[PDB]
Amino acid sequence: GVVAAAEKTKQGGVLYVGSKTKEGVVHGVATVAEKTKEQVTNVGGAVVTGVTAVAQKTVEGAGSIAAATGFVKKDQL
Amino acid sequence: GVVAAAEKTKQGGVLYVGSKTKEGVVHGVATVAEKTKEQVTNVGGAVVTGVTAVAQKTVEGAGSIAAATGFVKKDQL
Amino acid sequence: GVVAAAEKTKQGGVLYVGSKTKEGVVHGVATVAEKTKEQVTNVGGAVVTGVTAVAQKTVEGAGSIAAATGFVKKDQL
Amino acid sequence: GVVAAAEKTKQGGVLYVGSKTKEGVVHGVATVAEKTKEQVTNVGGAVVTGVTAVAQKTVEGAGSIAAATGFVKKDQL
Amino acid sequence: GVVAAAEKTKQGGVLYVGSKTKEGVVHGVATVAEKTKEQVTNVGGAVVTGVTAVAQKTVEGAGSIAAATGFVKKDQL
Secondary structure, eight states: OEEEEEOOBOOOOOOEESOSOEEEEEEEEEEEEESOEEEEEEESSEEEOSEEEEEEEEEEOTTOBOOEEEEEEOOBO | OEEEEEOOBOOOOOOEESOSOEEEEEEEEEEEEESOEEEEEEESSEEEOSEEEEEEEEEEOTTOBOOEEEEEEOOBO | OEEEEEOOBOOOOOOEESOSOEEEEEEEEEEEEESOEEEEEEESSEEEOSEEEEEEEEEEOTTOBOOEEEEEEOOBO | OEEEEEOOBOOOOOOEESOSOEEEEEEEEEEEEESOEEEEEEESSEEEOSEEEEEEEEEEOTTOBOOEEEEEEOOBO | OEEEEEOOBOOOOOOEESOSOEEEEEEEEEEEEESOEEEEEEESSEEEOSEEEEEEEEEEOTTOBOOEEEEEEOOBO
């Protein structure tokens, strides 16, 4: 008997300028696992079985990695 | 008996300029796994079995990777 | 007995300029797996079995990868 | 009998300028695991089975990694 | 009989400038594990099974890693 929830109830000369803005937002992520079986055997690699939530307004940079999940970088410069 | 939920109830001279804006937003991601079986055997690679939520307003950069999930980079420069 | 849900109920001289805008938005992603079996054997590659949600307003960059899921880059420059 | 929840109830010459802004925000992440079995055998790699929540306004930097989960970097410069 | 919750109830010539702003915020992360079994055998790698919450306004730096979870860095310069 399992559950995961995210709720938002609202039982209810102005001048907005650049306001009430959402920029790079993650909201309401619900996840359940029940009676799951997992066998990982990893060798030199990347395994991701979980929950990842990345919220970013700005990522500047030449050759930047802004959000990586399960990433194997093996470059030769 | 499994469940995952995300809800939003609203039982209810202005001047908006660039306002009430959503930019790079992830909202309401529900996921369930029950009685699942997984066998991963990974060697030098990338395996992603989970939940990923990436919300980004801006990613500037020559040769940038803004959002990578299960990525194997092995370049030769 | 499995379920995943995302709901939005609304039991209810203005001047909008560039307002109430959605730009790069992911909303309402529901996923279920029950009694699934998976055998992955990965060697030097990328396998993605999960849920990915990428929301991006802007990604500038010569040779940029904005959103990659299950990507094998092995260039020779 | 398991549950995880995140709620927000509101039973209810102005001038906003650049205000009430959300920038790089993670909100409402609910996760449950019940009667799950996991066997990880990792050798020189990265395995991520948990919950990750990254919220970043700005990440500047040439060759920067802003948010990495399950990342194997083995470059040769 | 297990539960984890995060709630926020509000049973209720101004001039905002750059105010009521959220920048790099993590809010409301609920997680439960019941009757889970885990066997990790890690050798020279990184395994992350727990809960990580990173909230950062700014991370400047050429070659900076702003938020890493399960990261194996073995570069050769």
